[PDB]
Amino acid sequence: IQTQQLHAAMADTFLEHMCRLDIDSAPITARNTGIICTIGPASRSVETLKEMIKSGMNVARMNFSHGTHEYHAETIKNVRTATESFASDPILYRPVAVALDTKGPKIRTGLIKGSGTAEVELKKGATLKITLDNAYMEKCDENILWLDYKNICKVVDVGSKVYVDDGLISLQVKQKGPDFLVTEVENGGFLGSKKGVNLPGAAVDLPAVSEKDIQDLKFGVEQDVDMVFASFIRKAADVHEVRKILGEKGKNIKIISKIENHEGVRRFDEILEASDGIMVARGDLGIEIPAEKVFLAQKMIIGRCNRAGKPVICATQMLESMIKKPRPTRAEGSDVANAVLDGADCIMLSGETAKGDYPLEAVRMQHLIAREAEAAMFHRKLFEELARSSSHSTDLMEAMAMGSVEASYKCLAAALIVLTESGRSAHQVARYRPRAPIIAVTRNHQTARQAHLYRGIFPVVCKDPVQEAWAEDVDLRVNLAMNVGKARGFFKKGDVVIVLTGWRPGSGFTNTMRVVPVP
Amino acid sequence: IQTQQLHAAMADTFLEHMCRLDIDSAPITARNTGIICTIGPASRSVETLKEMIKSGMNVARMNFSHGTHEYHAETIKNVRTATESFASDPILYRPVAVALDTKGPKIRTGLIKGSGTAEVELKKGATLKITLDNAYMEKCDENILWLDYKNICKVVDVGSKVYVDDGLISLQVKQKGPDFLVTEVENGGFLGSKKGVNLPGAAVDLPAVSEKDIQDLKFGVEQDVDMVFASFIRKAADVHEVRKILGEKGKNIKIISKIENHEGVRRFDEILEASDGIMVARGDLGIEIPAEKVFLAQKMIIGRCNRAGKPVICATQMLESMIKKPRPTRAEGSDVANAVLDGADCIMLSGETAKGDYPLEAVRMQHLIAREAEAAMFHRKLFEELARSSSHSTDLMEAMAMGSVEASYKCLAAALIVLTESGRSAHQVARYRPRAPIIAVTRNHQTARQAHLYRGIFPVVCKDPVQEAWAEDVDLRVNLAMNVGKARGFFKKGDVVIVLTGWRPGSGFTNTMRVVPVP
Amino acid sequence: FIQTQQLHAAMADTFLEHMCRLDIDSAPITARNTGIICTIGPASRSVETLKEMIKSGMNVARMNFSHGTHEYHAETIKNVRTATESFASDPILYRPVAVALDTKGPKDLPAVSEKDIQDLKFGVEQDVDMVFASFIRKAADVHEVRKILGEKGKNIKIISKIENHEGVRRFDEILEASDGIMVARGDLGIEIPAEKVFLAQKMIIGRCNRAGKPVICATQMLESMIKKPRPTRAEGSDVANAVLDGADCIMLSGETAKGDYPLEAVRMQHLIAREAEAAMFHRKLFEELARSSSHSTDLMEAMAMGSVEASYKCLAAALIVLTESGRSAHQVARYRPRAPIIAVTRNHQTARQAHLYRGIFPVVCKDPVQEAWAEDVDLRVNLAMNVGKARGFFKKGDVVIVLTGWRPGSGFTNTMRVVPVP
Amino acid sequence: FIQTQQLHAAMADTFLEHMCRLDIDSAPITARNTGIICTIGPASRSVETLKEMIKSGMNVARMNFSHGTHEYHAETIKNVRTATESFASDPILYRPVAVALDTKGPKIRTSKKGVNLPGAAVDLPAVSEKDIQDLKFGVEQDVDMVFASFIRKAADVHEVRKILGEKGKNIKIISKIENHEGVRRFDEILEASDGIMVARGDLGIEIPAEKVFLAQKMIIGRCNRAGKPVICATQMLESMIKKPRPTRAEGSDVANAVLDGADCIMLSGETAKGDYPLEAVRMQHLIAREAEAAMFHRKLFEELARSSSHSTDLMEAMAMGSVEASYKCLAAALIVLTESGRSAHQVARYRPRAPIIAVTRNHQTARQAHLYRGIFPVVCKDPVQEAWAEDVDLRVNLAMNVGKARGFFKKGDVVIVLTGWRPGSGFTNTMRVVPVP
Ligand SMILES: O=C([O-])C(=O)[O-]
Ligand SMILES: O=C([O-])C(=O)[O-]
Ligand SMILES: O=C([O-])C(=O)[O-]
Ligand SMILES: O=C([O-])C(=O)[O-]
Ligand SMILES: [Mg+2]
Ligand SMILES: [Mg+2]
Ligand SMILES: [Mg+2]
Ligand SMILES: [Mg+2]
């Protein structure tokens, strides 16, 4: 039985491809999908972070929805300590990226009239007036409810729906006022204090970057974060504002736009054009749109991201049950596998690593499933279709990337080696989805850290000084890649690899491709 | 905005098809994937079952792992009471099938020494003797463990793994003895009394049908069940053995083989050939094989069943969290949607409807997700690949089915109407996956109930007597389907349907196809 | 042993493997789907020669009005009709033959000259089945020909001849206006660089296939056979590749009009057509035609696609189509089954014009309309059974697709059946 | 506003839409990939006419030993070589010309026309005594290839191979398929042969004429599948023996033979004895260029890759990667440094639309490369530089200057360059996207 689902790889049709999937066809060692871990109480100690790295974590995510600057600064310090605890061995060292996830725009209710812990009950068909009057800020009850969104009246019409407490309660706008809305309770429940509010189908005019977000983005520039996950992006202008706040000092920080509501989906193309990558933020997205539609948006977005060559992250509740249990449900294994088959560059753990009981098991399981689904991709068709989608472009590096990936298919190369400094050459190789891993050797540490955003890039930091003879400097980096690959078990002596390098020191991309045996 | 993802339907490639999935494209009313609900304490009252039927239940599953014959007979009687409560209106009556799911062969440990309610701790790296000596049957502990599987020594080698308590505990056979096993605790835990044992990769020679199973199968025959879900099917002989047990009285009862371990997967083709259908029983399957591999087996199995035209069920933990919560996780919505896209004819609920707090919510969510994913199928490609896969067959009924489905694609027919008595004509239409629903009108009540196993067959019982004039009998049955379709909102006057009928009373299949406007 | 009709190649996954599987020992079927159009002139206008030309496979007779008086072509047409009707006693074996008038056209010139107007009116008076309109340059020329044919010739199919650069560049509007197209390669090869003709040919056939409108490939197909009894290798190749391109009909000009070997030329076109028809890649072609027409949801198109699909699946020996305007049969032929289409009609002009469509074998039912709709439908369906058995298309126990109207007022064949041959 | 070289049709999703987009106003490129093979005879064997034949595009000269003495054909070959070398002073513009020997094979003669017996068990030998003498004469004359008439089985090919023996071991054997048995036993014949000719003259008599195209498309397909050269021959422009312009069926035939995938097309009487040999060569050159652009390269590449997917050969990987890159960036050429020819052959099998400039120091490699679609061979006569990189750069720049001189590309255009990394590299393991200097 061939490894890596290669029998299924040879199928003519997608049906026969599916039919040939073999549970006894062992995957390869290398795992191409990036794993993004939300760091929290369960995972922010240095020792646990070392174990997260060993288990497969590639990006550490700090959710600034909560936590002080001091707290997240400590977390980032602990991440970097754990990461550098491995730095003595350049051949085993794994770059770990650092991501800042902004709090973004939020709509919150007031305090329920009473002592605290108090609740009111909303019965279907009842009347509830929403009021912006700060006089009712702490006197919410069954008849009057205050929320912090001063402009809500301008963005809602009669009959539009208002969700409260993460969609648990739904309201329909019956009458509209200047500083109030009169609504009928469509779906009822018990309402507590300071709950989340969502406005499905509305063009929310809250600022793209709030005052807290500006402070947090400047903090992230100060802490040398590799990338920002920007919340509730509804339009390209929101990305532009985030970019302006990051400004010239943070020009190289990768901006990942989070798609979280209907407008972000409807305007997704302009957002994608303006972004460096995308996160499918399925939790809030499933509150804003019918949950049964989320997969449509997920697949659309991953497809379009794959088309543009831009990183896409699938996030939220992928292994939810592992917050409390050491093993995932069958639905969760299926969700991770199908996100990989969809084409997600990275998959994410939220509560599973922030606060749950089994963060390391969660990371390890995402790693195992990811390797299995990577082999099960139908690469020949995927490659043909990606090439068809990008055919209006005649970019020279895409030509080399496509030629190199084709060569890697034809001779079943064990890896592609890419010498890169901005990372773009490796990015363009990853875009055309080879099955073999991409060992990207770079002297730019931030390039290495950001590379985790691209499917299949295993970044290696070259710390050697520049060799005077360009050819010998190239051979140095290629041999670094050979040794890393041998140590990680991706290939051995006598295997075949594709090597992408620059012809001369002034070559602006890897314009040179070779089939080389491993020494 | 085109409905039913028809814009994505027109794409040239799978990538572009995915890129065109649009959350604002509304699905049709008809829902094709069958929903199989496990009935238990949370759902067996007559009134709740009426709600189950209205919310979308097509098959009632009785899990005979537990429950007395009296309990399940009462449950089945309540299912039939609820079902017949709609029978006064033939146009609104919905056939509801009744399925018996056998307990099957099981390996169980002994009682923990003392009360029996005690537990002992199995420490990783510790040693554990498995024993067949009935003296330790009730004196199980941390050092010695008794199993009721007398032949285990015959089917296990040194280095084999033994899982205990639903995979929570893992043992590796270090030394093999005459009536015992010396094992190392690879994965530890607290071992209670009388827990399940699994033997990954082992050819378990327990009987296909246990002593309990024979009694339960005869009980199901007396109860006039439409179908049996036969547990732990490992090979064709097991399906035959079950078929023999069902005998002459149960010759028309459909046998659905549950693939639950490695051997059933490895020997899947012969099992498929011998069965009427297949269940991807992901729970036990994920205990027997690495959970990260279950999706492979799922897609392979669904593909192969789709290839053969035989019903396939996806089962277990699809909406697991809904046992305790009123809405599913995003991983669960993804799981259901991808099961439908895989091509599963039916999706299943177990604890979610048997015992959970939100059974009706689970049914409703499966129904909504199924409709959205059905629209998102890539019908043109699926049809081409199914046809290519079956191209060595020149069967006349397949020819009629493919022509009818092709015509239904071309003119966007609102439905296909198929007059059938054995069901085979409707089965062959459903096999070639039209997007429009299949209204199968039959005088055979059992055919109507069993048709629920096939994607898209909406079965309708004709209770009228046979008309002397064949043409008038045909028109009677066709108008019944038209009236059901209008009442269910599947089409209205002026829409177009495909109608498949027999030319004369002696036609052995629907050899006549028409494109008809809805009156 | 060896599958017939290039069916082994039919099962191929790629076009390359389809080529690699072409087997000179895989026998074609008896039926020949590509229409044969013969220019009649001195070598072929006698009643006896025309009888043998029908028997050899001529389906359409073309009168080239570049030269000749009305009296001369009138007599040619009379002899055509005499030879044709000599077979009319046997309705099972009678073969309808269409009569086509090819206008002289421009020889800054107007689309339709004064001579051309008189000739077109003559064609109306002569009851021609179709007009081949020379040097069509734009849709307006087609509209002129249509107005000149007027109400009396409103049923005369207008086949525009694409003969220069402008006609190619403006081909889409011409095709929209036309009932069909001829790739008139003689003049086209002079008006545009000869080495580009194949591009034009392949483009035009493709677009006509996309539309379901008849396309004729014409001129010098078997040129050397004017003076020689056997074709050159390039000429056999040219006929075969014109069939593979998708031509509904292939044409003979001097080869039958004035050459020494008219019958041999017709027979050679018949043989090559039959072999090339089997060598088509039907699965991909059907998929690509369906893809191209998917914005249409027409009901008869759906019936045609479903019936062609069913005929592929069960390898039906034929599709039997009951039709009066021909449209039902035209829609079936458009989706290119490999099996012959036996179109039974009571409209004689319909039967004659059906030759413009690949695979339509027209059969004129002469019995009177039966009182019961079901019995009249069986009458025409059994007419087709008897024709197919007599012509060697099928025998008892074979499977045929049968397309009929359900009830008397059906506006198309809305009923499809898979039927055993009696 | 109108793409060249049928690039709009190149973007189609289906074969049908690819046909519908074929555009007579889309200009083809200057380079012509299909090799042109000319039979030399009384109408064309003079040194001056042969110069004009080279300039019109003749790539291979064919000596038909059905008639003529050794001395006569020796003189024809001598004149070919004189005409060819008259251009050798300029290595940038020198065009290698291959010499081919076409054996007489079995014949039946009666005034003394040939006789054909379809379906007869002709007892004639595979290789006659005259055939043996002519093959040895070809070895003595340093012919680049042999067209072996009437091969019926692999054993016939093996006989010709043995007769050529060790002294002629590099002479390419092109089996001529011209009767039913050769078609039926084609797979073993292809395996044993270096290439194939579809000898449609004899084939159209030995099998029913209406079946010839079936054989032609089958054979070209299988030869394309194997990467072995296939020639389409006989009566492609027959009417041009006596007329200055071809018939429509003849233009169609040449164009469809290129579309089928034939590496070469041939002229026999049209150049051997006809009144318009130069015109026949020029007509094939023009039609080839138009049909070459009209190929459906994307589907063709997918299907060739699919049929060869069981191979993981490294040079195949380089060729497929280089051709894929040449499609993506619309490169004007692929430059291939080769000595045996194998690397360039492997590129040619995967059918780029851009021309393949094969730079070699092996003169016979250069002459034989004309059997492969798109290989424009260039003879490097410079001495070997001491530094490998400098020698590679020297040959690559020779190719640059050739492409600039021939109008294939200009400064600032993009080319794919296939070279060996080190002198002992056994194939072109190095690919670059390079700007033209
Ligand atoms: O905001 C998020 O991260 C989400 O909802 O997934
Ligand atoms: O039996 C089942 O349903 C299972 O294990 O999934
Ligand atoms: O008129 C014609 O038939 C032509 O020019 O080919
Ligand atoms: O020998 C040949 O070239 C032929 O037969 O065509
Ligand atoms: Mg959010
Ligand atoms: Mg189970
Ligand atoms: Mg003309
Ligand atoms: Mg010969």
Author numbering:
A (entry chain B), B (entry chain A): 12 to 530
C (entry chain D): 11 to 117, 216 to 530
D (entry chain C): 11 to 120, 204 to 530
Which sentences did the original study use to describe this structure?
Rabbit muscle pyruvate kinase (WT-RMPK) was the first demonstration of an enzyme that requires monovalent cations for catalysis. Eukarya pyruvate kinases possess glutamate at position 117 (numbering of rabbit muscle enzyme), whereas bacteria have either glutamate or lysine. Those with E117 are K+-dependent, whereas those with K117 are K+-independent. Residues 114–118 form a short loop that connects the A and B domains.
Therefore, the authors constructed the mutant E117K and found it was K+-independent with ~12% of the maximal activity of the wild type enzyme with K+. The structure of the E117K mutant shows a tetramer in the asymmetric unit. Subunits A and B are the most complete ones with 519 residues out of 530, missing only the first 12 residues at the N-terminus. Due to poor density, subunit C lacks 121 amino acids, missing 11 residues at the N-terminus and from 121 to 203. Likewise, subunit D lacks 11 residues at the N-terminus, and it is missing the amino acids 118 to 215. Thus, a different conformation of the NZ atom in K117 is observed in both subunits. The NZ atom in subunit B is within H-bond distance with a water molecule, which coordinates to the Mg2+ ion near the oxalate ligand. Such an interaction does not occur in subunit A, which has much fewer water molecules in the vicinity of the oxalate. The partially occupied mutant E117K mutant is also facing toward the active site. When Lys was substituted for E117, the enzyme became K+-independent and acquired its active conformation by a different mechanism.
